[PDB]
Design an enzyme around this catalytic site. Structure first.
Site, mmCIF file in Angstrom:
data_model
loop_
_atom_site.group_PDB
_atom_site.id
_atom_site.type_symbol
_atom_site.label_atom_id
_atom_site.label_comp_id
_atom_site.label_asym_id
_atom_site.label_seq_id
_atom_site.Cartn_x
_atom_site.Cartn_y
_atom_site.Cartn_z
ATOM 1 N N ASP A 41 30.429 45.748 -12.881
ATOM 2 C CA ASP A 41 30.670 45.089 -14.164
ATOM 3 C C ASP A 41 32.130 44.755 -14.366
ATOM 4 O O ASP A 41 32.712 45.051 -15.429
ATOM 5 C CB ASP A 41 30.116 45.928 -15.315
ATOM 6 C CG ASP A 41 29.961 45.233 -16.662
ATOM 7 O OD1 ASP A 41 30.102 43.974 -16.726
ATOM 8 O OD2 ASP A 41 29.736 45.928 -17.645
ATOM 9 N N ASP B 194 35.753 50.882 -17.664
ATOM 10 C CA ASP B 194 34.323 50.569 -17.806
ATOM 11 C C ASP B 194 33.908 51.287 -19.087
ATOM 12 O O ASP B 194 33.812 52.521 -19.090
ATOM 13 C CB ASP B 194 33.517 51.092 -16.599
ATOM 14 C CG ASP B 194 32.081 50.601 -16.529
ATOM 15 O OD1 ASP B 194 31.407 50.891 -15.526
ATOM 16 O OD2 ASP B 194 31.635 49.932 -17.480
ATOM 17 N N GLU C 269 31.934 52.316 -31.014
ATOM 18 C CA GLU C 269 30.779 53.076 -30.533
ATOM 19 C C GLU C 269 29.686 52.177 -29.986
ATOM 20 O O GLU C 269 29.561 51.016 -30.389
ATOM 21 C CB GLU C 269 30.230 54.082 -31.581
ATOM 22 C CG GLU C 269 29.408 53.510 -32.724
ATOM 23 C CD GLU C 269 28.981 54.567 -33.727
ATOM 24 O OE1 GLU C 269 29.820 54.971 -34.564
ATOM 25 O OE2 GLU C 269 27.808 54.996 -33.675
ATOM 26 N N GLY C 270 28.919 52.740 -29.061
ATOM 27 C CA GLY C 270 27.778 52.096 -28.429
ATOM 28 C C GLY C 270 26.545 52.943 -28.659
ATOM 29 O O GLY C 270 26.557 53.833 -29.517
ATOM 30 N N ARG D 193 36.863 42.367 -20.362
ATOM 31 C CA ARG D 193 36.497 43.342 -21.427
ATOM 32 C C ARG D 193 36.525 44.780 -20.852
ATOM 33 O O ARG D 193 36.610 45.737 -21.619
ATOM 34 C CB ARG D 193 35.095 43.032 -22.020
ATOM 35 C CG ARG D 193 33.954 43.169 -20.979
ATOM 36 C CD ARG D 193 32.542 42.940 -21.524
ATOM 37 N NE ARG D 193 31.607 42.904 -20.395
ATOM 38 C CZ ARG D 193 31.393 41.824 -19.647
ATOM 39 N NH1 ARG D 193 32.008 40.684 -19.925
ATOM 40 N NH2 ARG D 193 30.582 41.886 -18.598
ATOM 41 N N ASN D 194 36.376 44.932 -19.520
ATOM 42 C CA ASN D 194 36.373 46.234 -18.842
ATOM 43 C C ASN D 194 37.708 46.607 -18.203
ATOM 44 O O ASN D 194 37.771 47.562 -17.439
ATOM 45 C CB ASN D 194 35.205 46.377 -17.847
ATOM 46 C CG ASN D 194 33.914 46.556 -18.593
ATOM 47 O OD1 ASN D 194 33.889 47.145 -19.685
ATOM 48 N ND2 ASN D 194 32.816 46.065 -18.041
HETATM 49 O O1 LIG Z 1 37.301 52.511 -19.380
HETATM 50 C C1 LIG Z 1 36.745 53.518 -19.797
HETATM 51 N N1 LIG Z 1 36.165 54.430 -18.966
HETATM 52 C C2 LIG Z 1 36.172 54.380 -17.546
HETATM 53 C C3 LIG Z 1 37.388 54.292 -16.876
HETATM 54 C C4 LIG Z 1 37.426 54.162 -15.497
HETATM 55 C C5 LIG Z 1 36.243 54.121 -14.776
HETATM 56 O O2 LIG Z 1 36.344 53.949 -13.377
HETATM 57 C C6 LIG Z 1 36.191 52.711 -12.874
HETATM 58 F F1 LIG Z 1 36.415 52.683 -11.579
HETATM 59 F F2 LIG Z 1 34.970 52.243 -13.038
HETATM 60 F F3 LIG Z 1 37.029 51.841 -13.413
HETATM 61 C C7 LIG Z 1 35.021 54.236 -15.432
HETATM 62 C C8 LIG Z 1 34.989 54.369 -16.812
HETATM 63 N N2 LIG Z 1 36.686 53.786 -21.170
HETATM 64 C C9 LIG Z 1 37.374 52.887 -22.106
HETATM 65 C C10 LIG Z 1 38.772 53.310 -22.503
HETATM 66 C C11 LIG Z 1 39.513 54.198 -21.730
HETATM 67 C C12 LIG Z 1 40.842 54.462 -22.027
HETATM 68 C C13 LIG Z 1 41.447 53.844 -23.109
HETATM 69 C C14 LIG Z 1 40.713 52.976 -23.919
HETATM 70 C C15 LIG Z 1 41.333 52.329 -25.091
HETATM 71 N N3 LIG Z 1 42.591 52.442 -25.413
HETATM 72 C C16 LIG Z 1 42.854 51.704 -26.545
HETATM 73 C C17 LIG Z 1 41.816 51.044 -27.076
HETATM 74 S S1 LIG Z 1 40.412 51.320 -26.156
HETATM 75 C C18 LIG Z 1 39.378 52.723 -23.613
HETATM 76 C C19 LIG Z 1 35.886 54.954 -21.613
HETATM 77 C C20 LIG Z 1 34.996 54.813 -22.802
HETATM 78 C C21 LIG Z 1 36.236 55.650 -22.885
#
Ligand SMILES: O=C(Nc1ccc(OC(F)(F)F)cc1)N(Cc1cccc(-c2nccs2)c1)C1CC1
Ligand SMILES: [Cl-]
Length: 280
Positions: A142, A160, A18-19, A146-147
């Site tokens: 960004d 992201d 969480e953030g 990590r992203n």
């Molecule tokens: O990465 C993202 N969100 C996201 C995605 C794509 C996006 O478009 C861009 F172009 F910018 F890439 C923007 C934002 N997450 C993290 C995320 C997603 C899926 C799986 C996982 C995990 N599976 C295992 C451990 S953690 C984590 C969201 C916060 C949820």
């Protein structure tokens, strides 16, 4: 256009992290295709969530994490994404580096550092996602390991977390959190973010990949890193980095944004190197 998911169809398993404005859970989703998914729960908040949902519905590519939709009927608001079993790429690199055997669990499969072929495959996939975003005139702002996320079979996609700000140390407060170690001089100095600052960040991602996840400028404080970057200092070639890969990083790091190589050319060169090493 945004797909809606019933709250009954989402079975939360556990909180992954969480953030300040969101919580990420591992969950099971019914009637989507049992299916594992990553669920973001929101802690104005709305309208920003609505713009985000519309954007994530339109971004569709093999190397962009899959967004399945939202859950708005009830509280909190939810965003549903595919589950990427091997987590974030920075942790993945750090756990599959030169000290992999020391860190490995007894049952881990073939523990050891990722080889050149695997590192190029990771790099090529991230570049492919960036080619797609540049084609849409979308600026990530960004890009960093990590992203990015890793799925089974070394599948790598761009994401992201937003909540990345576990990695608070990768951001500097001036006055907004900025990932200064991944940014070019024009972004640090004037907040000028473009597809050319993203290609610079991709060169930094290539450096993180070939150092097995080290933080760029790790020897330096945030203020020392800002000074090195604006002065034009380049990160050192990693021990595992071939000279051809370092030349690609250097192409991303040209001082003038217009002089940086395009992400399409960078992707083409990494694919060519990956192809040349496949059978060797
Ligand atoms: O990465 C993202 N969100 C996201 C995605 C794509 C996006 O478009 C861009 F172009 F910018 F890439 C923007 C934002 N997450 C993290 C995320 C997603 C899926 C799986 C996982 C995990 N599976 C295992 C451990 S953690 C984590 C969201 C916060 C949820
Ligand atoms: Cl060179």
């Amino acid at each position: 256009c945004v797909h809606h998911i019933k709250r009954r169809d989402i079975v939360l398993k556990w909180e992954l992290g969480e953030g300040a404005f969101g919580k990420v859970f591992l969950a099971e989703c019914h009637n989507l295709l049992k299916m594992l998914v990553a669920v973001k729960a929101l802690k104005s908040a709305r309208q920003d969530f609505q713009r985000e949902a519309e954007l994530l519905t339109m971004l569709q590519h093999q190397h962009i994490v899959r967004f399945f939709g939202v859950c708005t009927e009830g509280r909190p608001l939810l965003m549903v994404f595919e589950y990427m079993r091997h987590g974030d790429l920075n942790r993945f690199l750090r756990s599959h580096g030169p000290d992999a055997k020391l860190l490995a669990g007894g049952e881990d499969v073939a523990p050891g550092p990722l080889g050149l072929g695997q590192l190029l495959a990771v790099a090529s996939q991230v570049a492919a996602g960036m080619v797609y975003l540049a084609g849409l005139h979308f600026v990530h702002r960004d890009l960093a390991t990590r992203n990015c996320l890793v799925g089974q079979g070394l599948v790598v996609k761009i994401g992201d977390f937003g909540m990345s700000r576990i990695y608070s140390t990768d951001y500097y407060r001036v006055g907004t959190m900025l990932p200064i170690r991944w940014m070019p001089p024009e972004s640090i100095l004037y907040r000028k973010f473009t597809t050319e600052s993203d290609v610079w960040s991709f060169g930094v991602v290539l450096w993180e990949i070939f150092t097995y996840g080290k933080q760029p400028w790790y020897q330096l404080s945030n203020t020392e890193a800002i000074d090195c970057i604006t002065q034009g200092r380049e990160l050192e070639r990693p021990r595992a980095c071939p000279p051809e890969v370092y030349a690609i990083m250097r192409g991303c790091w040209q001082r003038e944004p217009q002089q940086r190589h395009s992400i399409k050319d960078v992707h083409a060169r990494l694919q060519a190197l990956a192809q040349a090493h496949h059978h060797h």
